[PDB]
Design a protein around this ligand. Structure first.
Ligand SMILES: [Mg+2]
Ligand SMILES: [Mg+2]
Ligand SMILES: [Mg+2]
Ligand SMILES: [Mg+2]
Ligand SMILES: [Mg+2]
Ligand SMILES: [Mg+2]
Ligand SMILES: [Mg+2]
Ligand SMILES: [Mg+2]
Ligand SMILES: [Mg+2]
Ligand SMILES: [Mg+2]
Ligand SMILES: [Mg+2]
Ligand SMILES: [Mg+2]
Ligand SMILES: [Mg+2]
Ligand SMILES: [Mg+2]
Ligand SMILES: [Mg+2]
Ligand SMILES: [Mg+2]
Ligand SMILES: [Mg+2]
Ligand SMILES: [Mg+2]
Ligand SMILES: [Mg+2]
Ligand SMILES: [Mg+2]
Ligand SMILES: [Mg+2]
Ligand SMILES: [Mg+2]
Ligand SMILES: [Mg+2]
Ligand SMILES: [Mg+2]
Ligand SMILES: [Mg+2]
Lengths: 78, 103, 50, 99, 227, 77
RNA sequence: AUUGACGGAAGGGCACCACCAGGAGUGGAGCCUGCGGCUUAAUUUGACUCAACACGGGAAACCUCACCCGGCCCGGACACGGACAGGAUUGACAGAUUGAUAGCUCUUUCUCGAUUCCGUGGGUGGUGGUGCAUGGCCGUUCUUAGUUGGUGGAGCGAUUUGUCUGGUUAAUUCCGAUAACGAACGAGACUCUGGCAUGCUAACUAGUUACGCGACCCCCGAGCGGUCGGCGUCCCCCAACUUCUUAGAGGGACAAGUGGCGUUCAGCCACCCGAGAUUGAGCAAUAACAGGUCUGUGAUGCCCUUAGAUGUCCGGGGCUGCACGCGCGCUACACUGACUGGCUCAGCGUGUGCCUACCCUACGCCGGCAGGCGCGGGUAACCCGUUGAACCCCAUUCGUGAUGGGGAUCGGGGAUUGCAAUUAUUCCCCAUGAACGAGGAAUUCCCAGUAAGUGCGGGUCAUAAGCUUGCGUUGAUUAAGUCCCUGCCCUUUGUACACAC
């Protein structure tokens, strides 16, 4: 199916909004960060959340995605 | 001095492994040659019954099962020292069986 | 009175809960009816893992 | 029912000595496990306790093909006057507490 | 010694002993708030720990009833005399115990009380005792001579998966009445609490909990302290 | 403040036995036996102040469980 | 006017309990087994489309047993009254009698010693009735995606928005549009299991590798030669180690990386690296159904019966009866085979029992076989056991013939279990040798270690599997789609329906 559910997406979004300064586009370092900063009860949910976090950080670079509010708004002086 | 063998049996892995850890740590603190935990093959006892009390339905079955885990510890020490290695807060679902080099 | 031999068969064995002679489970030394087993399984220690 | 007086005296003596009486619902067991030395059938234990329960001298419980009987405070006085016991002898359960 | 038995038969026999002892105590100490039994093996004695709400009636009159229970347990299960001691202990919180609450609802129904006020009272007590959710289902001949089932829910109640084995405790009981038998199902969802006896330790497996970031005042110009 | 709440006490239990029970941990200051009004026995509660907040903090983990007079007693702050 | 249900309405979606492409079939034959009918003393009975019919764990010789024939027993508490140590009343050897060595009944008299007997009330027991009085459990709708509050918007409400045009997904799974926003149950997550680790923790109840001893083979004189499930290094070094085995902790996979499509969104397709890019199950919502079970229960209401008993025990019979009609299956119709011999490989898992009698078996000796007699191991990673399984593989015979295919039916004999084998329990040997030449109309189940072939354990079990439940072994054809058929779900639409035409 490969369709991530609401728990994965909502958790990923809150993780990004609170810890944007510590996530790159690297699934393994993201996985380690999300296992340090969150309390995820399993390892499959940890991996799915880190995967969606990686996929979203690969979209933050190409414009503000609808749903995430971060400090990146300030640097848009234009 | 004998070849004392402690056999620990349980239905859950957590308490069994923690009792094994306590015994090994207590025995290592008092300088014993401890041949550590040997793990025998877990026995799975399986009973498959019909779900229904009557004899009507879609013929579905119920698969109950119970695992039994077994651990061994080999000490080479006098009896009175193993009498204080053991007797330290054995968990409920664990059962020990000392064999003092003879039946 | 109780003259007939009852050393084997369904007559010899009965459930240890209800004394019913049908559906008896003798495996591992239970001697329990299938329904009584299905009721007391969790108390005995038979979890339903799969 | 009809049982020898020795059997009834033995059953009552054991019941008053402990204060409890356990039996198995099996009318064909030839000897009761606790009274085997006096050779009483299980049926006599079951029916003597039935005759005691209907008069209100024992409380009865039943679980998993086994009867349990406790000796009430009327049964104590009854069996004390029946067995001709001096009123100092006490059942094991009642009044044998320990500080 | 002469008695030796395979580990399979031994574990099944131990489970059967615990099941029969629990059934006997459930029938015997029903109106005393009996919740559970725990058999603890010690080198000198065998301790049967009875969990009850009203442990003073379990103890009896100056210890009489606990002595009678000890005597029947010894005489039925064939323990050596003096090797089995029965202790009673009070359950910590009564609201988070489905067996105690099912028995409470049972005895409230045995006395003359209406089924709806009794279920609402039990449900309100369970919810006020810290439960995340509760469900009480009473089925039987409630209104007339055509049976129906009335359920009363308040709060969260999970049903499926593995968490329903440690976050939910259920209890089924019967109530013999003049016109029939009533069935009482009570199930309570315990609250999460780390390092506590109120409920489970491990959280629900789909409850991510992000730790709040510390306030991070940023630096302006590099500085270093030579301590 | 040396607060000890003994629970699950027996009817036989009086001030003296609680005294002799907590005496191997030291000296006492104030026993409080929650007796029944107009009826001479306990209601299942005892409030103990041990004149020092440290040895009571040792005895809470000591006299826990213990099965006194066929009643397992739960002690708490 | 609203909510449900229905329409021999109109649009979308989904499913090998639906189809398409196919595989194996079933339906045809013989037999095993369940149901109906018929017969009978009785042939106990529940259930009838899926959701009845190898189902009641239901493979019934006795028991089970509920049915039929016949005969004992009270295991009729307790209360009241009567009779009673001048005996209330229990047992009983002999003859008859009986199926009986039931003192059941009769003659005969002994014995027992307040426990009983007899009337009235009241118990108790019941695989008796009612599952359309019920509890629990189970099945089904439906394992499909469905269900419901809080606040806010819309109305006198009932109701309704959320819960949606569309895209996507296994999924009311998400993304988007947007009077909704934020949530809950179900789905997912979760638990068990399968696949990976020469990394960690360890092991004479698992082994490997070295070393030593021994047997055998070549050889010229041969060898850091080859074979060894032969022995030993467990007397503590006089060897180390964990690859294989076991099982703990962690790690590991996330559509993560690269292209392409897509509203550059959720996602989909392909590929690299990888053990693995969809392992298989368990659990499983709100509402229901006069679904099944009173024959699982010391779960249970009411009714029936209760001593010439529908309690209970014993003896015998029956469930199995046989012109016939169905359902689940097993064996086959042969040469891609049968027969004879030879050679080589498994994985689950069980094993001496409270009452309870009944375990798995190595090795030796008799017998042609089933079997018998000795003797030892095992309460089990210790013994059976390196579980020498079958199909398969290698050679021989046969030769397209109802044949050396098939093994029904039937005759004779020998053993085992049991207290008892006839209406054949099961097993073995010789003999007989039927239909059946690939099965009409219809119809089932299924997509990867899957179908199918092939054996082995468990349950039942004193005796026993053509059943079921698991396990490995050899191992594919076809497909990566659709709404045509059969059903479900949603939306619009009509209603004189709300116990749903
Ligand atoms: Mg959920
Ligand atoms: Mg799930
Ligand atoms: Mg087709
Ligand atoms: Mg076939
Ligand atoms: Mg056929
Ligand atoms: Mg269906
Ligand atoms: Mg048979
Ligand atoms: Mg016969
Ligand atoms: Mg019969
Ligand atoms: Mg007679
Ligand atoms: Mg005679
Ligand atoms: Mg009954
Ligand atoms: Mg029904
Ligand atoms: Mg029902
Ligand atoms: Mg509103
Ligand atoms: Mg019906
Ligand atoms: Mg029932
Ligand atoms: Mg009979
Ligand atoms: Mg039949
Ligand atoms: Mg069928
Ligand atoms: Mg042939
Ligand atoms: Mg022929
Ligand atoms: Mg078998
Ligand atoms: Mg069968
Ligand atoms: Mg079809």
């Amino acid at each position: 199916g490969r369709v991530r559910t609401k728990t994965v997406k909502k958790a990923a979004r809150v993780i990004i909004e609170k810890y944007y300064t510590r996530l790159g586009n690297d699934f393994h370092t993201n996985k380690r960060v999300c296992e340090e900063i969150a309390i995820i009860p399993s390892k499959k949910l940890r991996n799915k959340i880190a995967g969606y976090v990686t996929h979203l950080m690969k979209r933050i670079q190409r414009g503000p995605v609808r749903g995430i509010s971060i400090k990146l708004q300030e640097e848009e002086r234009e | 001095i004998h070849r004392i063998r402690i056999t620990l049996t349980s239905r859950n892995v957590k308490s069994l492994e923690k009792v094994c850890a306590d015994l090994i740590r207590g025995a290592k603190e008092k300088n014993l040659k401890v041949k550590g935990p040997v793990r025998m093959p877990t026995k799975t006892l399986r009973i498959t019954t019909r779900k229904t009390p009557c004899g009507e339905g879609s013929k579905t079955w119920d698969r109950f099962q119970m695992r039994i885990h077994k651990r061994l510890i080999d000490l080479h020490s006098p009896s009175e020292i193993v009498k204080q290695i053991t007797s330290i807060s054995i968990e409920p679902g664990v059962e020990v069986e000392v064999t003092i080099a003879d039946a | 009175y109780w003259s007939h031999p009852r050393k084997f068969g369904q007559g010899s064995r009965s459930c240890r809960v209800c004394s019913n002679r049908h559906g008896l489970i003798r495996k591992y030394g239970l001697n329990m009816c299938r329904q009584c087993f299905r009721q007391y399984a969790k108390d005995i220690g038979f979890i339903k893992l799969d | 029912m009809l049982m020898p007086k020795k059997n009834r005296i033995a059953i009552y003596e054991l019941l008053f000595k402990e204060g409890v009486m356990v039996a198995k619902k099996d009318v064909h067991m030839p000897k009761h496990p606790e009274l085997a030395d006096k050779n009483v059938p299980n049926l006599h234990v079951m029916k003597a306790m039935q005759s005691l329960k209907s008069r209100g001298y024992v409380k009865e419980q039943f679980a998993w093909r086994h009867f349990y009987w406790y000796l009430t405070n009327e049964g104590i006085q009854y069996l004390r006057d029946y067995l001709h016991l001096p009123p100092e002898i006490v059942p094991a359960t009642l009044r044998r507490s320990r500080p | 010694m002469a008695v030796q038995i395979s580990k399979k038969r031994k574990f099944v026999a131990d489970g059967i002993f615990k099941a029969e002892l629990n059934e006997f105590l459930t029938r015997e100490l029903a109106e005393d708030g009996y919740s559970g039994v725990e058999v603890r093996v010690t080198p000198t004695r065998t301790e049967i720990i009875i969990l009850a709400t009203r442990t003073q009636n379990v103890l009896g009159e100056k210890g009489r009833r606990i002595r009678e229970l000890t005597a029947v347990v010894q005489k039925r299960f064939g323990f050596p005399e003096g090797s089995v001691e029965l202790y009673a202990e009070k359950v910590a919180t009564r609201g988070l115990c489905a067996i105690a609450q099912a028995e409470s609802l049972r005895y409230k129904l045995l006395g003359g009380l209406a089924v709806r006020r009794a279920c609402y009272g039990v449900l309100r007590f369970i919810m006020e005792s810290g439960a995340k959710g509760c469900e009480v289902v009473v089925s039987g001949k409630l209104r007339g001579q055509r049976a129906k089932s009335m359920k009363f829910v308040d709060g969260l109640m999970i049903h499926s998966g593995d968490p329903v084995n440690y976050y939910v405790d259920t209890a089924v009981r019967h109530v013999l009445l003049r016109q029939g038998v009533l069935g009482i199902k009570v199930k309570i969802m315990l609250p999460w609490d780390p390092t506590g006896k109120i409920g489970p330790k491990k959280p629900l497996p789909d409850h991510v909990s992000i730790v709040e970031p510390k306030d991070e005042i940023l630096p302006t110009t590099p500085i270093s302290e030579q301590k | 403040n040396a607060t000890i709440r003994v629970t699950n006490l027996s009817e036989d239990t009086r001030e003296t036995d609680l005294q002799e029970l907590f005496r191997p941990f030291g000296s006492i200051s104030r026993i409080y036996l929650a007796k029944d009004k107009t009826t001479g026995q306990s209601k299942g509660f005892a409030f103990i102040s041990f004149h020092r907040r440290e040895d009571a903090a040792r005895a809470i983990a000591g006299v826990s469980g213990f099965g006194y007079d066929h009643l397992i007693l739960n002690v708490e702050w």
